[PDB]
Amino acid sequence: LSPEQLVLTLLEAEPPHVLISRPSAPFTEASMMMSLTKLADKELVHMISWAKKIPGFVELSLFDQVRLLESCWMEVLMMGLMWRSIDHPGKLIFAPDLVLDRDEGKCVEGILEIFDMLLATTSRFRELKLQHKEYLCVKAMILLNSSMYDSSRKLAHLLNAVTDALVWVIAKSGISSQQQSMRLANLLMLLSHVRHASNKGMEHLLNMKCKNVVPVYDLLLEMLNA
Amino acid sequence: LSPEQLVLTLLEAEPPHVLISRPSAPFTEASMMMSLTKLADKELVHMISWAKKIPGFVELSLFDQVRLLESCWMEVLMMGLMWRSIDHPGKLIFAPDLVLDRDEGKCVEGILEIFDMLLATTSRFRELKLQHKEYLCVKAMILLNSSMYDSSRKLAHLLNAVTDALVWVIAKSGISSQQQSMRLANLLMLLSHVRHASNKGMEHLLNMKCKNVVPVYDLLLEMLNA
Numbered sequence: 061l062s063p064e065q066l067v068l069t070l071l072e073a074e075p076p077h078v079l080i081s082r083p084s085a086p087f088t089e090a091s092m093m094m095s096l097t098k099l100a101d102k103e104l105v106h107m108i109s110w111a112k113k114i115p116g117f118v119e120l121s122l123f124d125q126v127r128l129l130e131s132c133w134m135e136v137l138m139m140g141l142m143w144r145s146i147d148h149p150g151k152l153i154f155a156p157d158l159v160l161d162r163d164e165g166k167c168v169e170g171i172l173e174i175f176d177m178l179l180a181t182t183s184r185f186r187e188l189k190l191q192h193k194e195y196l197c198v199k200a201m202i203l204l205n206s207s208m209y210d211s212s213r214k215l216a217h218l219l220n221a222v223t224d225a226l227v228w229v230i231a232k233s234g235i236s237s238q239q240q241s242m243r244l245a246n247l248l249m250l251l252s253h254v255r256h257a258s259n260k261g262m263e264h265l266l267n268m269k270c271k272n273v274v275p276v277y278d279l280l281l282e283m284l285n286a
Numbered sequence: 287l288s289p290e291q292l293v294l295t296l297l298e299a300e301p302p303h304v305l306i307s308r309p310s311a312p313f314t315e316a317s318m319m320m321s322l323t324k325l326a327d328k329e330l331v332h333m334i335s336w337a338k339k340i341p342g343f344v345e346l347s348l349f350d351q352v353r354l355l356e357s358c359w360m361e362v363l364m365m366g367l368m369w370r371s372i373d374h375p376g377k378l379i380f381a382p383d384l385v386l387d388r389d390e391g392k393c394v395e396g397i398l399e400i401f402d403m404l405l406a407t408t409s410r411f412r413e414l415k416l417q418h419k420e421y422l423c424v425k426a427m428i429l430l431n432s433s434m435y436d437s438s439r440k441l442a443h444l445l446n447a448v449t450d451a452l453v454w455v456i457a458k459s460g461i462s463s464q465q466q467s468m469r470l471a472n473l474l475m476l477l478s479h480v481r482h483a484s485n486k487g488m489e490h491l492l493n494m495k496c497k498n499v500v501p502v503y504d505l506l507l508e509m510l511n512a
């Protein structure tokens with residue numbers, strides 16, 4: 061399985077876009093939290109289908125597959141969120157029909173700081189001129205590398221193959237050899253930012269759940285608690 | 287500055303280790319916290335001199351300097367802890383006479399979870415055989431890549447010089463171009479985990495401050511509230 065086939069497959073596995081519209085009424089802390097959670101919940105199903113299409117994921121132990129998923133879902137969602145919002149400064153494209161403005165975050169306590177984060181990070185990928193093929197590779201890496209802790213070996217092999225796919229895609233651009241290393245370094249240092257946004261969001265979401273301001277759905281309730 | 291000279295500036299920037307010792311009686315939740323917040327607080331004074339000795343940091347604006355330090359302080363402390371602990375598996379060398387074992391996390395509510403992370407990441411650096419020069423570059427990249435932001439171009443420039451320095455340090459090993467790209471991605475992917483550990487560590491510390499188990503007072507408090 062060459063780095064070329066792996067990217068091809070990643071493109072195929074791309075999860076389709078989830079559609080969600082704005083509720084019929086001015087956004088209240090309640091309506092917003094519901095819109096985002098329902099959206100996240102629906103997305104989580106597609107992520108799982110995406111993970112399993114990644115060569116070698118299904119071959120990992122059952123408990124590691126869920127360990128990697130429970131650990132990276134917010135990161136993977138916010139990275140998808142960023143790619144969508146890349147060409148639209150100041151906006152967050154949660155869905156084709158759900159494009160919140162920065163200031164619109166002031167409708168939910170504390171989420172405004174999270175919107176700024178996602179916006180700045182997205183702004184950073186924008187300046188980097190993030191390519192679609194790099195995004196696909198970067199997204200798959202967040203998954204395989206999300207968890208700290210015969211199966212560990214396969215994982216190692218899997219992250220290795222994906223890293224090799226990013227390198228290759230980067231090289232395909234025709235830029236300097238010295239630039240290949242700088243760009244690789246730049247894309248990866250942004251993973252800490254994506255990770256930081258994910259940590260903060262989950263904190264926020266968890267507290268919304270405790271403040272019981274939002275009911276939980278089938279699958280998302282299992283991920284948050286983890 | 288050429289890579290080699292930048293790395294020497296980084297070496298000269300390395301501050302002394304803060305010495306602390308095991309308290310009088312066995313560890314109480316309160317004394318253990320007093321020990322950790324006491325250690326951090328004294329290390330922060332050293333971390334500030336360290337950052338000021340990094341090429342270009344003092345040329346950044348006053349507010350930027352503080353923004354970077356407030357954003358990454360914990361990440362930097364944990365990374366140094368990892369370096370000091372890299373050769374002693376199962377132990378966290380907070381200081382020469384403060385070597386806690388995994389099972390000593392059970393003295394504080396919720397910090398055992400953090401210890402495990404800290405040891406897993408350290409263990410990760412150990413298997414990659416992290417060389418001192420690499421350690422120096424990564425710690426500096428953490429400070430410069432911390433915040434999610436004329437003085438703006440000064441940073442991406444600063445950061446790029448340290449990355450180039452790391453890129454050089456890896457090349458000096460003489461390994462394959464492919465292995466040079468893999469080692470860089472593996473070292474950089476780990477920054478995410480460090481950031482993650484830093485995030486939990488602070489949530490925990492902020493929580494303790496509320497339970498007032500830890501009397502986080504001066505300097506350190508300025509780093510937490512932010």
Ligand SMILES: Oc1ccc(-c2noc3cc(O)ccc23)c(O)c1
Pocket residue numbers: 096097099100103137138140141154171174261262264265268
């Ligand atoms: O409290 C919350 C709830 C949802 C999010 C969120 N961020 O990015 C997203 C991308 C999605 O596709 C679906 C939900 C989110 C958040 O950052 C905080």
Ligand SMILES: Oc1ccc(-c2noc3cc(O)ccc23)c(O)c1
Pocket residue numbers: 322323325326329363364367380397400487488490491494
């Ligand atoms: O509540 C707390 C208090 C201190 C720490 C800590 N982690 O790593 C460290 C490294 C240091 O050099 C000094 C303090 C800490 C923590 O993770 C949670």
